Paper text:
Escherichia coli bacteriophage T7, a member of Podoviridae, has been used as a model for understanding the DNA packaging mechanism common to tailed phages and related dsDNA viruses. The phages package genomic dsDNA into a round procapsid using the portal in complex with an ATP-dependent terminase complex as the motor. At the beginning of phage infection, the tail is responsible for receptor recognition, and the portal and tail act as a tunnel for DNA delivery into the host cytoplasm. Here, we determined structures of the DNA packaging intermediate and mature capsids of T7 using cryo-electron microscopy (cryo-EM) and symmetry-mismatch reconstruction.
Six trimers of the tail fiber [name] N-termini anchoring to the adaptor-portal interface were clearly resolved. Each [name] N-terminus is formed by a jelly-roll barrel and a 22-residue α-helix. The distal parts of the fibers, which are too flexible to be well resolved, were observed to radically extend back on the capsid shell at lower resolution.
Residue numbers in the entry:
A (entry chain b): 5 to 125, 129 to 138
B (entry chain c): 6 to 124
C (entry chain a): 3 to 125, 129 to 143
The structure:
Amino acid sequence: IKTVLTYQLDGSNRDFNIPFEYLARKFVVVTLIGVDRKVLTINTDYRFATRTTISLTKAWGPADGYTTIELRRVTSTTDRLVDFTDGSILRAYDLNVAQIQTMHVAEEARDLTTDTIGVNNLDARGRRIVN
Amino acid sequence: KTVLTYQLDGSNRDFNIPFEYLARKFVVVTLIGVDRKVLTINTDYRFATRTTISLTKAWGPADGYTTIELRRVTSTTDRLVDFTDGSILRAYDLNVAQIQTMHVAEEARDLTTDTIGVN
Amino acid sequence: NVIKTVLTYQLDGSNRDFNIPFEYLARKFVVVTLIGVDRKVLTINTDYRFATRTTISLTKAWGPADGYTTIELRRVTSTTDRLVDFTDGSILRAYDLNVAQIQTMHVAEEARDLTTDTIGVNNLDARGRRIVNLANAV
C-alpha cells in the first residue's frame, strides 16, 4: 500500500514524493511511462531531494511526448543485502534487515496484481500477442 | 486456497477455516456481491476453537449477502517479531520470522491466478 | 518487469545444451519443460544431466519438427517444505541462517515472478499459452 504509482506530470513541475520506504538508494526505479517506456538514471536526471521526494533535473512535460513517471520499488533477488559469514557476530539488526527486505519483495508482488489485466465487468492494450 | 468462498443457509455460523494464520486480525472476512461489507472482530466475530470462525450469529443469505468469502491478509508492515539484542532467540521465533514472509508470497500469487488464470 | 526466473530459450533444431542464470537453491527446484504442441516435463537423472553448476545438458536434441518449439525452464521452490528448520541448539551456522533466508527470498521472488508470467505487460500482454476460453465474439 502502495509501491507502484503514477503521478501526473506537466512541465515545470519536477518534485515528486515517495510514499513507501525504499530500504536502498537504487531500489527505486523511475520510469516516465510516456508514450513509450524510458528508464531514468540515478544522477543524470532525477536526484532524491530529501530522501522522500524525487527531484527532476529536466522537468519533463507531455510536450516532448511523455506522461507519466511510474516509480516502483524493484527489489532485487540476487543483490541480497544481508549475508551471514562465519562469525562476524549476528547483531539483531542483521537478522532484521534480512527479514525486512524479503517482505519487501513479497509485497511488491501484491502491487504487481493491479498492473496486469484487471476485470472491469478487459484492458486498453494496443496489442495482445503470441496467442 | 488462501482465499475460499462460503455460501450457506441462514442462521448457521460454525465455519471451519483452513489456511492457517499467524495473528487473528489477519483473517479478514467479508459480505458479498451486492456489497463489499467488511465486518469487524469484536462487534461481530470471535474465533472459538482457533480453527473456526463461529461466526457471529445469523447473517445469511437473505439480505443480499450470498455469502461469505473469508481470506488471509497478512500485514507486511507490522512485523510480528522484532529481533532485539539478546533477549535470546527461541527456535520457534527463527522459524516464524521466515514463515510470515513466505505467506505474503502464497497470498500474492493466488489472487493473481483468479484473474485470467493459469490452467 | 522483468521475468528473472522463468525463461524460454529458442530450442532451435539440434542444440543440446542451455544455461540457467537464476540462483536455484536445489537441483529439483528447476523444472524444465518443453513447449510447442505440449507441456512435456522431463525427469533429471535419466533424460538430462545437469551439465555443470549452471548448464542443462539435455539428452537429446529435441524439436522443432518432431514436436516441441522452445525448451523453457523455471524455478519451482517448495513453499511448504522448508530446507533448514531451527530447533533448540543446534548452534546457528552461517550456512543455516543464509539458506533459510535464501529460500524465503526465492519464494517471495518466485511469487512476484509468477504473477507477470501468467498474463502481463511485455517490455502489451504476453505468453505462449492457449488462453483457453472466452466464449464470445462481439
